[PDB]
Amino acid sequence: RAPXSD
Amino acid sequence: RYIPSLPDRILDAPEIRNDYYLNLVDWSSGNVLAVALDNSVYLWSASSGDILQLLQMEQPGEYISSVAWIKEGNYLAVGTSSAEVQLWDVQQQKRLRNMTSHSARVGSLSWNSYILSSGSRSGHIHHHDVRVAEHHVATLSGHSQEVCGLRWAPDGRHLASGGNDNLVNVWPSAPGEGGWVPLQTFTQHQGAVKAVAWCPWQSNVLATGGGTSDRHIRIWNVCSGACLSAVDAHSQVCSILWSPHYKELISGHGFAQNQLVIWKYPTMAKVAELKGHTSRVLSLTMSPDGATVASAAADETLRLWRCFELD
Numbered sequence: 484r485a486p487x488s489d
Numbered sequence: 490r491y492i493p494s495l496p497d498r499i500l501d502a503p504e505i506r507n508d509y510y511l512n513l514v515d516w517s518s519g520n521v522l523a524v525a526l527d528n529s530v531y532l533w534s535a536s537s538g539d540i541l542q543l544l545q546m547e548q549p550g551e552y553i554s555s556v557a558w559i560k561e562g563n564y565l566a567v568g569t570s571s572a573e574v575q576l577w578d579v580q581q582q583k584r585l586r587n588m589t590s591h592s593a594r595v596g597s598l599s600w601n602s603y604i605l606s607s608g609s610r611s612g613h614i615h616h617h618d619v620r621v622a623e624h625h626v627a628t629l630s631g632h633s634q635e636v637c638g639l640r641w642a643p644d645g646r647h648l649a650s651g652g653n654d655n656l657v658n659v660w661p662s663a664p665g666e667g668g669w670v671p672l673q674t675f676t677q678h679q680g681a682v683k684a685v686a687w688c689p690w691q692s693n694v695l696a697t698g699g700g701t702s703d704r705h706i707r708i709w710n711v712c713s714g715a716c717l718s719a720v721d722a723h724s725q726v727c728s729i730l731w732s733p734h735y736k737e738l739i740s741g742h743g744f745a746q747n748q749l750v751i752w753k754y755p756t757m758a759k760v761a762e763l764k765g766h767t768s769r770v771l772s773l774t775m776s777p778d779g780a781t782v783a784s785a786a787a788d789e790t791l792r793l794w795r796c797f798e799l800d
């Protein structure tokens with residue numbers, strides 16, 4: 484889960 | 490008018506703090522969104538999609554409690570659980586200041602040119618002149634519980650504050666020859682007031698919204714003290730924004746629909762509801778062009794709604 488990724 | 494039912498973007502917000510009183514997102518005049526996720530602040534450049542982890546708290550237990558961009562968009566104020574107000578230069582990606590003056594977490598922030606106002610869980614509001622060594626230049630004490638909403642008027646003539654003590658205070662821009670005393674104190678909300686927003690085209694018009702036990706949006710004239718409108722939103726009102734182009738307001742909510750509501754001003758007629766969040770909305774922020782509203786919610790998403798444009 485990458486922060487602020489789409 | 491046509492308003493899209495889907496957001497333009499959905500950004501992951503893992504570890505977002507599900508705390509109603511915090512002000513965790515802000516969209517800069519340079520078109521960069523700052524998002525506080527637990528102990529870190531991320532920056533997302535809307536034009537390119539670039540993401541940067543600007544900072545992370547250095548000690549265990551510490552979390553980010555507020556973020557606010559200066560008007561020019563080059564400096565970001567960051568309030569912390571350890572009662573600090575940090576000033577970050579985002580072009581240099583470095584901390585310029587670590588301002589201590591508060592006795593508890595700093596959950597709300599608002600700028601007026603180089604003055605940065607900070608509200609704390611203690612109930613106090615501090616004005617900081619961020620350009621000078623002795624930054625703490627004023628203390629405004631009109632709340633007995635956490636200051637969760639804090640907003641300078643666009644013309645800088647008034648500062649509005651909302652608290653977990655169910656009060657809204659409207660402060661003057663200067664103390665003059667008297668003390669720091671509110672020009673108005675509105676006690677009509679029967680719940681916490683996190684939602685505070687000034688009308689961009691009318692100097693003295695303010696919108697406030699109350700928590701779960703209140704559920705109302707109220708519009709005031711701060712000069713006359715008049716309550717111009719009181720509308721039941723049927724849910725807590727976490728945030729309110731005004732469109733600087735459509736003469737509309739948008740509000741964010743919790744149980745049961747977790748929706749955003751668009752209202753027509755001055756009739757306060759409901760124009761639309763933006764649904765999709767699966768947990769309560771925490772905060773709203775607006776893009777510098779006024780076209781898009783970012784909603785941060787307890788479902789660990791940031792939804793960007795292009796609800797004020799067709800392009």
